[PDB]
Amino acid sequence: MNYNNKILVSESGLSQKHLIHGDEELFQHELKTIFARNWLFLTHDSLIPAPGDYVTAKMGIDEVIVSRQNDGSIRAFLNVCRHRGKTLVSVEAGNAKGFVCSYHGWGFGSNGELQSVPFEKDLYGESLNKKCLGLKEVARVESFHGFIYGCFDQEAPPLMDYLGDAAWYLEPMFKHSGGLELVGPPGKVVIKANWKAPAENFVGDAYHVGWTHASSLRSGESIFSSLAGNAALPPEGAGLQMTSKYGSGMGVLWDGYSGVHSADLVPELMAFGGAKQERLNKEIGDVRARIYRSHLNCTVFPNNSMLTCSGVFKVWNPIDANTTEVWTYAIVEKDMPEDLKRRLADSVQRTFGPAGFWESDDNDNMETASQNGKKYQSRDSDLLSNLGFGEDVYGDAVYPGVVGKSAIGETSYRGFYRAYQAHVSSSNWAEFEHASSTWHTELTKT
Amino acid sequence: MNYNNKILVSESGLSQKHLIHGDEELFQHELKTIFARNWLFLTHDSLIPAPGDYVTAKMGIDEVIVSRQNDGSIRAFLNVCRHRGKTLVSVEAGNAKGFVCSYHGWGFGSNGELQSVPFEKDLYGESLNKKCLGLKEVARVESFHGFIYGCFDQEAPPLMDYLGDAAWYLEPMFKHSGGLELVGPPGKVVIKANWKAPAENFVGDAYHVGWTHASSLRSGESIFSSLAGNAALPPEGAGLQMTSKYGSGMGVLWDGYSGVHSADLVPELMAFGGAKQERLNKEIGDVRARIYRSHLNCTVFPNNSMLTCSGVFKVWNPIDANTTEVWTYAIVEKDMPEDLKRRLADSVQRTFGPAGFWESDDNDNMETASQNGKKYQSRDSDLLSNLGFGEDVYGDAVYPGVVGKSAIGETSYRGFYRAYQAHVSSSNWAEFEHASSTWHTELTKT
Amino acid sequence: MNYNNKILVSESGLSQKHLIHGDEELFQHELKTIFARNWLFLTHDSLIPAPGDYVTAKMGIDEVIVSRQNDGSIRAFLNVCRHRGKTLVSVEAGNAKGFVCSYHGWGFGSNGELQSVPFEKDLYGESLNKKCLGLKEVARVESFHGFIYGCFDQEAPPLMDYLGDAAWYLEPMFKHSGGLELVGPPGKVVIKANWKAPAENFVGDAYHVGWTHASSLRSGESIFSSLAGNAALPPEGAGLQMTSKYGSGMGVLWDGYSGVHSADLVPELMAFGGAKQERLNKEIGDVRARIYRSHLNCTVFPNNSMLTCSGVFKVWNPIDANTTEVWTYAIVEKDMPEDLKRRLADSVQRTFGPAGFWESDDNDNMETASQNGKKYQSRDSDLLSNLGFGEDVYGDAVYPGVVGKSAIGETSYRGFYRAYQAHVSSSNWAEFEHASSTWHTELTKT
Amino acid sequence: INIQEDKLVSAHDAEEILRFFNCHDSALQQEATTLLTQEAHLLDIQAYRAWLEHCVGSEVQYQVISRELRAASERRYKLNEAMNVYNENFQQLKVRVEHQLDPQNWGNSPKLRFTRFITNVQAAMDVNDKELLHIRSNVILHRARRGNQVDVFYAAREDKWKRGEGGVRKLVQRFVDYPERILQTHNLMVFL
Amino acid sequence: INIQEDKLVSAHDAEEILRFFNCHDSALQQEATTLLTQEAHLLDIQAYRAWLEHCVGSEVQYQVISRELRAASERRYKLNEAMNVYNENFQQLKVRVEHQLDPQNWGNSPKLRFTRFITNVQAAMDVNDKELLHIRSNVILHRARRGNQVDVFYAAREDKWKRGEGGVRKLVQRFVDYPERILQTHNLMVFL
Amino acid sequence: INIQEDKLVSAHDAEEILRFFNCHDSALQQEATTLLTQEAHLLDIQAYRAWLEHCVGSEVQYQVISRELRAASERRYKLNEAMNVYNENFQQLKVRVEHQLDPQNWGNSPKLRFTRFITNVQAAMDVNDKELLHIRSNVILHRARRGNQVDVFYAAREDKWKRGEGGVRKLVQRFVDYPERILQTHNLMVFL
Ligand SMILES: Cc1cccc([N+](=O)[O-])c1
Ligand SMILES: Cc1cccc([N+](=O)[O-])c1
Ligand SMILES: Cc1cccc([N+](=O)[O-])c1
Ligand code: FES
Ligand code: FES
Ligand code: FES
Ligand SMILES: [Fe+3]
Ligand SMILES: [Fe+3]
Ligand SMILES: [Fe+3]
């Protein structure tokens, strides 16, 4: 397939070829043009707070070691020995000053440097140039309010610019709340879906909630529960949708601070968020204080998703075109009482974790939609994302980005897939930028 | 591989490259040139008799919904939602007026039309053109005496013409018997064989029976049992072989109406078939009445096989070059007593079902022959199908098609593979026809 | 990938692209340029001593039948029927005058000839040319002191010339000891590693022993045990390394006749080897008699490895780029007492068999190094084999081949991979020879 | 169990539960365990003739079904719900046993390896036939052959056992509703 | 067990061993086996309401953890070691049961098939609470759905059971430390 | 069992059947179940030293074979039929245990997870040695490590147990004929 010419996503993001969820050659191409190029979630400060703390993480199909340095910075390196290529670290988290390879005993620092080689003097003499044998380093590592992302491409935009218009929506919760903590360890489960299936669902999909999650809404004791079985459409002005130049997007469901949490947690949460909102009105204004305590379903392009307020944090780690390894953490506000943080973390896993009853509702949808993309008669078929097209705006005086001023639509799908197609058809960031110079005009046509 | 030029099947069908049973690129090519082009078995009237009755079926690797319409016709549609591509129907059979997608709740009629969209007015307004969003329909659906086949290619010959000379042999049992019923549900088992291995075996292979099925012949209490361990060759004139332009073929074993059925059923069956034959002599003549009560091992090209009289009906559903999903139904004559139909159905499964002791005899043969087609030193090796070559006729005054007037030979292999090669090297039906204008001359050389 | 031009192994064998352990297209290319071209281990005289004795063996991904003929020679044939391609033999060893196919009953002799066809007269008449339907024969089968190798390429050098300078090192144990026996049946285990990972480890890797096998050295009660945890470097002159034109190589650890065997066997073995060495001094000289009772870790290119004295004999049978089927036999000296042979065989399996505690130490090293070769950021990375480079010699007055006069280095890696690259980039043996006309000069640079 | 409340429970399954919830007889559970362990041992060593002689009653029905996947809400489609993978009388089991023992059963060389794991044994005498013993048990059945073929079967068995010749309890009915609709084991040519 | 000598053994596991090594009561092992077999039967037939009513105590904690992979020598990194796949009280189990029984649970049509294999049952009364029964058992749980989806779960269960209403012994705690870190079963939406 | 009639049955297997078909002692079956359950518990928690001390006799032979695939009709080829995956005396088991516990066993970090399922227990005293207990049992052994590595082993175990120091019954022989010829579990580095 010629990725320069092939129209995988139609103009304005209105449709995508179903093969994008099944084609293994395209998957291999995504490794280069999506995963090696864009910002990928690694960890949180709260998981590696002290010097020497480390975790392992995936970046695409590659595995990296992410380590807190003595100077307080974080550096990340391929989890692969520079000698004969053995995996260096076999655990998920720990604290160490370095990492020793179990094959021939080479020792690397927490800073990636090759520090020791057994019997170096007797064996290599002065011939081994250790200075050139440091672990392969992730070029770019940056933080968004404690959330640490990596990028293999030195040419990428800074993380903040990459978030584009999405950052404005995230800041009330990520910044103005006093800050968030990630509660580990994550749940980890493999699903037989393409990574884009859950990515698209979280970025942009409020339409599915009432029907897909009918049983979870009815059973589960929650604030959005009037939606069960499409019994009731959210009222006018119940929310909005947005998207951005570099593909990140989200839905906003006004005021839904208790999110998916069962009636057990609803009063406590609604009190806590309301009280903080009252303080924030003075600092950031009523609209942004309201956004703080509003439910955001967001995808940070390509494959990191979250539900703020519900506290769900997801990484859709790609394995192949029909296999994804799902990592699920809980996010909590640092100034919540510790007992509430504990119960919130359990509730996140209860709903969206490995035995998450809500997450379970989504399984067949994502799996079959993905697997159908391999089927002969469906490869060249068009997945539709036209809901709300011709009603989006850009440059609004209150809400930035390409915005659909309705709770339910496909605005964020369109922006996600516009960015996806611009990357797939480009060889580098310069080409992506050239392909994106009229991004918002494309999205607001008709 | 260049399928226009590559000789995969030699002149007159005398040999095939072993790679045809192993090569995944060829498998993908077959999806286009075999499965998307030819007639494939879907179901029987007896399984969806009433309006709203449906079943799911495979056509190649695609899954379809096959539905009895209110007007009494049958239509078939891809089992894939027109919105984001989720599998629509998760069951194998049922009765419904429509199908609702579990992702976002889109509702399609039994006629494939997009009938409803949740909150269409509020969400899409008048912008959704539902008339263009019907399920992707199988272009061609036709019946052969209640047996329903589908074809994705509008240019295909009618089913009856596609059966070619094979139809004459099938009609005494399929038509003149009063008609057949398919007894469901089928057994379903995955085997590690190429779909062509069982297809070729059923089309054409009486040679294997005595040796492959020695234990089943000896143990099993049946009418062909003198063959056990090649203890005895069928007498002169015990049968014949035939093949046809579009690849369908069969063996005829004269008089073997009890087929593989164990001595328990032999007297009852031999009485029943003999009695019907006596009535049919007057209606269709002695030869065709005899054919009615003769055992036919047949493949309807590409991947539907049957043993008439034994009552075995097979679909070899392709998964990949070394994986096939085997569906096994029982066929019975409508006017048999119900208790006999019941016992016949059980006997079909007893012999050729998921725990079919006869079918079990074939497993290693098909699996290893298929898997060997992947092995480096065997890919370019020649599978032989020359038995009886130079003794076949065409245009016989009594028996139509290319016919070998002997019970055991490879006539039907040659015709199957001649058709296969003509399809693989052609881009459309017109090219197949051009490649087949001297089909019978090719098969009767020497 | 263009294998004529792609530099997979750098000049002098100093590094290899990590993708060589992961790339499936390269694996398929190796089937042609490594496995169909080079000598592969089949069996030992001791396993098929009598006329009619046979075993099955893999040669690459192909399976062969290896049979002792009436005239005392050995012939090997593809385990694939010449009719429709079924696997002929389903057992690992036996005694027979021929092999009958379970599909249609064709009977082949132990000499590969098609001897009988059921009902040939009635069915084929005189038309079947059985003389042309013999099993596909392995072109070349030769013995090295009872160890039987096969080669599909008629143009290969004789086995003895193919062993090159390695033969001189093997002869004291394989020949001058009175001869070896292979004790079957082998252990068989699948590992998720490329075949080259264990091949390279055995050819050339003493560096890993102290660290990788620290626990086995400490626990296991053995002669090399001072190495545990890199507690002590072997003394000056404790051994050497060698390699050869056609890729075979080994390490020599002077005097280590008890090898990995636990203290239980050490005194007995050290007595037995010392006593034979005293006799051999007179016959082959002190250096070669010493080599007899020295531990050799050797790979016979491509995929047969051994530890002499320890008595470990390995075949790394390729399945795909990250899957290998490991066969493990024991080698014993024919003139050892039978009770000692029995205990030695058990000890080989105890240490290096399916539950071999030493072999277990190597699992993660080989598996992850192999699997990392698929990972996007590692494919184009360089595996290093530079230890000892610029200190190797050729044409030494005492020790032949390219020789590193130190116990620990990467001399043998360099020669293995120089041969590998010469084969991968060549279409035939003539091209390999042209690519290897300066092999030792390349290896001894700097 | 009220199946109007426990919406996922079939009438058949509710009836079978009731059977074991009443009289619990610990001694009967122990006898049943012995019976099934000995049966499994005979099958695992491929003593199929011994299995028929010692374990299987002359009036046996040995049945394994595969049920078509239907909608949980389905209430109109009425056609045959299941097919019989096995539905054997004693003579039909004997045919299968002869087929296993036949020296031209090529698939049985080299010899197969079977290992059976029998768990969750429950036993209760029939209410109306004091000589009929109901036994329920679950089986994992591991079949290995030909170097690298491995098939594992999982099933619940509803049995009736009755004392026969010599007072030996023998199988008079086995019913298995096989839980996997599409078999991924090459075949179901094993005695569950 | 001395865990300074048996270097791979956790303090928790050593404590649990000690419990069963002392008073062995054969009758208690038999009762526990019955209890667990009946529980598994109710779950296998998807009688989830009956399971809550007959098997689960009002004060239950039903917990399945997934523990982060850490170095065996690790002694500095101190953060949360595990997450809760399940950590349910009775009301939370009831929510999950209602979710299973809801007629718009689309994933439950066609009906799932469950088979459970319960083995290695051990039982011991608590030392200090004479009415608290400790039961340990291992489970293999086979879930099949949708023609060709098959998921098999393997776990050890540390339970406490206590007599409740009507004198019926009911589950008051279940603890499972799930042995596979990354699930390869699509989810863990099964009651172990 | 007549092995001339039951053509698939080995003399060895027929001999082992006879052992358990005679004196059935229910109490002995119960003791054997306890013994094996406790053994499996110790192994599952990786208390390998405790296993040697409490479960394994000084005179033990611990043997697991892999048998070459031969023709069922084979009668001429006579060479070694099997190899020993394990054939350990007590000192050799102790070496393996030390290897497991060694802090430089890199493959044991992060810690492995084992779960064992022991079923089909049969027990019979030896005819001639009144102090020798024959126990047969089947095991499923689940090993999980490193996030997504899962290996499951299936085997029948022929054991002899005898009272040793302190009157504790200890393993004096275990024999397993491993049913899979080519292992698909990376290795057989588990104590069956
Ligand atoms: C529970 C919930 C609520 C809003 C949005 C999503 N989503 O996009 O997955 C999920
Ligand atoms: C039992 C039987 C009888 C005739 C033909 C076949 N066949 O081709 O599979 C099978
Ligand atoms: C135990 C041992 C000793 C020397 C060399 C190797 N090797 O290369 O695997 C192994
Ligand atoms: S592979 Fe890491 S030290 Fe050699
Ligand atoms: S995928 Fe079917 S309604 Fe959206
Ligand atoms: S395939 Fe061997 S005789 Fe036909
Ligand atoms: Fe959802
Ligand atoms: Fe057949
Ligand atoms: Fe090693």
Domain parsing of chain F, residue ranges: 1-192
Residues 6+ apart with CB under 8 A from D35: D135, D161, D169
Neighbours of C310 (CB within 10 A): 28
Q: How many whole angstroms separate alpha carbon B185 and alpha carbon B43?
A: 11
| Shortest-distance atom of ligand 4 to CA A82 | 2
DSSP readout, A28-93?
A: HHHIIIIITTS-EEEEEGGGS-STTEEEEEEETTEEEEEEE-TTS-EEEEESB-TTT--BS--SSE
B238/C contact by beta carbon, under 8 A = no
Q: List helix spans (H) across C164-265.
A: 166-171, 196-204, 209-212, 214-220
| Shortest-distance atom of ligand 3 to CA C204 | 8
DSSP 3-state of C313:
strand
Closest CA to F31 of F149, F167, F139: F167
* Torsion (CA) C31, C54, C146, C38 in degrees, nearest 10: -10
Same domain, B192 and B63: no
Distance from Cα B212 to the centre of ligand 6, integer Å: 10
Give the ligand with the smallest distance to the CA of C116: 6
Do B and F touch, counting CB pairs below 8 Å (3 needed)?
Answer: no
| Shortest-distance atom of ligand 2 to CA B351 | 1
F118-121 contacts at long range (C-beta below 8 A, 24 or more positions apart): F118/E119, F118/E120, F118/F33, F118/F36, F118/F37, F118/F40, F119/D117, F119/D118, F119/D119, F119/E119, F120/D37, F120/D40, F120/D41, F120/D116, F120/D117, F120/D118, F120/F156, F121/D37, F121/F29, F121/F32, F121/F33, F121/F36
Phi, psi of A64 (to 5 degrees): -125, 155
Is the CB of B201 inside a 6 Å radius of any atom of ligand 2?
Answer: yes
DSSP readout, chain E?
A: --TTTSTT--HHHHHHHHHHHS---HHHHHHHHHHHHHHHHHHHTT-HHHHHHHHEEEEEEEEEEEEPP--TT--S--S--EEEEEEE-HHHHHHHHHHHH-TT-GGGSSPPEEEEEEEEEEEEE-SS-TTEEEEEEEEEEEEEETTTEEEEEEEEEEEEEEE-GGG-EEEEEEEEE-S-SSB-SS---S--
Phi, psi of A24 (to 5 degrees): -70, -30
Domain end marker among C131, C164, C197: C164
The whole-angstrom distance between C80's CA and the closest CA on chain B is 7
**C362 in a labelled binding site:** yes
Q: What angle do CA D120, E56, E144 make, to 5 degrees?
A: 50
Q: Which tokens is C27 given?
A: 């694996």
Neighbours of C437 (CB within 10 A): 9
Q: List helix spans (H) across A261-394.
A: 266-284, 286-292, 338-352, 357-371
Residues 6+ apart with CB under 8 A from D176: D63, D64, D65, D155, D156, D157, D158, D192
Residue contact A184–E87, C-beta within 8 A? no
What is the residue with the minimal CA distance to atom 3 of ligand 5?
A: B104
Is the CB of B309 inside a 6 Å radius of any atom of ligand 2?
Answer: no
Q: How many whole angstroms separate alpha carbon B287 and alpha carbon B252?
A: 12
Q: How many whole angstroms separate alpha carbon F8 and alpha carbon F5?
A: 9
Q: Counting beta carbons within 10 angstroms of the beta carbon of residue B69, is it exposed (0 to 12), middle (13 to 18) or buried (19 or more)?
A: middle
End-to-end CA distance of chain F: 28
Q: Which tokens is A423 given?
A: 């990357």
> What DSSP designation does A268 have?
H
The whole-angstrom distance between B182's CA and the closest CA on chain D is 11
End-to-end CA distance of chain D: 28
B78/A contact by beta carbon, under 8 A = yes
Same domain, A73 and A17: no
Q: Counting beta carbons within 10 angstroms of the beta carbon of residue B4, is it exposed (0 to 12), middle (13 to 18) or buried (19 or more)?
A: exposed
Q: How many whole angstroms separate alpha carbon B57 and alpha carbon B73?
A: 17
- Which positions in chain B touch E148 (Cβ < 8 Å)? 190
Neighbours of B380 (CB within 10 A): 9
Q: How many whole angstroms separate alpha carbon D167 and alpha carbon D171?
A: 13
Q: How many whole angstroms separate alpha carbon F30 and alpha carbon A64?
A: 52
Q: Which tokens is E170 given?
A: 């009911």
Q: How many whole angstroms separate alpha carbon A299 and alpha carbon A314?
A: 9
Same domain, C73 and C189: no
Closest CA to B387 of B12, B9, B8, B14: B14
Neighbours of A72 (CB within 10 A): 9
C142/B contact by beta carbon, under 8 A = no
Longest alpha-carbon distance in chain C: 78
Q: How many whole angstroms separate alpha carbon C148 and alpha carbon C43?
A: 5
Neighbours of F150 (CB within 10 A): 18
Same domain, B141 and B178: no
Nearest-Cα residue of chain B relative to residue E111: B91
Instruction: Tell me how the structure was determined.
Output: X-ray
Q: How many whole angstroms separate alpha carbon E39 and alpha carbon C147?
A: 61
Q: How many whole angstroms separate alpha carbon C108 and alpha carbon A164?
A: 74
CATH assignment at residue A188? 3.90.380.10
Q: How many whole angstroms separate alpha carbon E171 and alpha carbon E159?
A: 7
The whole-angstrom distance between B274's CA and the closest CA on chain D is 26
- Name the neighbours of B, counting chains with at least 3 Cβ pairs within 8 A: A, C, D, E
Q: Which tokens is A354 given?
A: 């490995």
Domain end marker among B164, B193, B214: B164
Residue D151, strand partner residues: D143
D84 closest CB neighbour out of B93, B188, B349: B349
Q: Counting beta carbons within 10 angstroms of the beta carbon of residue E4, is it exposed (0 to 12), middle (13 to 18) or buried (19 or more)?
A: exposed
CATH assignment at residue A62? 2.102.10.10
Which positions of A are annotated as active-site residues? 104, 205, 208, 213, 362
Same domain, B287 and B315: yes
Same domain, B2 and B62: no
Residues 6+ apart with CB under 8 A from C70: C51, C52, C110
**A81 in a labelled binding site:** yes
Q: How many whole angstroms separate alpha carbon A159 and alpha carbon A140?
A: 9
Q: How many whole angstroms separate alpha carbon C420 and alpha carbon C434?
A: 14
- Would you tell me which residues 284-303 of chain C have a C-beta closer than 8 angstroms to some C-beta of chain F? none
- Rama region for A146: left / alpha / beta (φ>0; ψ in -120 to 50; rest): left
Is the CB of B83 inside a 6 Å radius of any atom of ligand 5?
Answer: yes
Is C362 one of the annotated active-site residues of the chain? yes
Same domain, A243 and A383: yes
Residues 6+ apart with CB under 8 A from B394: B401, B402, B403, B440, B441, B443, B444
Same domain, A401 and A424: yes
- Rama region for A311: left / alpha / beta (φ>0; ψ in -120 to 50; rest): left
Residues 6+ apart with CB under 8 A from A166: A242, A244, A248, A249, A250, A298, A300, A401
Neighbours of C438 (CB within 10 A): 8
Domain end marker among B113, B141, B164: B164
Residue with tokens 């023609």: E147
Count the residues in chain C: 446
Number of domains in chain B: 2
> What is the domain range of residue C133?
36-164
Q: At what angle do helices F90-101 and C357-371 cross, to 10 degrees?
A: 40
The whole-angstrom distance between F57's CA and the closest CA on chain A is 35
Same domain, C16 and C102: no
Residue type, A419: A
Closest CA to A66 of F115, C430, A74: A74
Cα–Cα distances (Å) from B117 to A78, A205, A228, B82, F76, in that order, read 48, 15, 16, 11, 75
Same domain, B245 and B147: no
Q: How many whole angstroms separate alpha carbon E174 and alpha carbon F93?
A: 35
Residue with tokens 């404005």: A168
Cα-atom radius of gyration of chain D, to the nearest Å?
Answer: 18
Nearest-Cα residue of chain E relative to residue F145: E180
Same domain, C207 and C346: yes
Q: Which fold has domain D1-192?
A: Nuclear Transport Factor 2; Chain: A, (3.10.450)
* Torsion (CA) E53, E56, E57, E60 in degrees, nearest 10: -140
Q: At what angle do helices A357-371 and A338-352 cross, to 10 degrees?
A: 40
Residue type, C32: K
- Which positions in chain E touch B326 (Cβ < 8 Å)? none
Residues 6+ apart with CB under 8 A from B222: B216, B258, B259, B260, B261, B262, B263, B266
Residue D62, strand partner residues: D88, D174
Q: Quote the strand ranges of D33-131, DSSP E.
A: 56-67, 82-88, 113-125
| Shortest-distance atom of ligand 6 to CA C106 | 3
DSSP 3-state of C217:
helix
Cα–Cα distances (Å) from B165 to B311, C83, E135, F106, in that order, read 21, 28, 71, 70
Is B320 one of the annotated active-site residues of the chain? no
Closest CA to C136 of C164, C158, C108, C116: C108
- Which positions in chain C touch D110 (Cβ < 8 Å)? 90-92
Q: How many whole angstroms separate alpha carbon B344 and alpha carbon D67?
A: 19
Is the CB of A128 inside a 6 Å radius of any atom of ligand 4?
Answer: no
Element of type H or E holding B276: helix B266-284
How many CA atoms within 13 Å lie on the side-chain side of E80?
20
Phi, psi of C412 (to 5 degrees): -75, -30
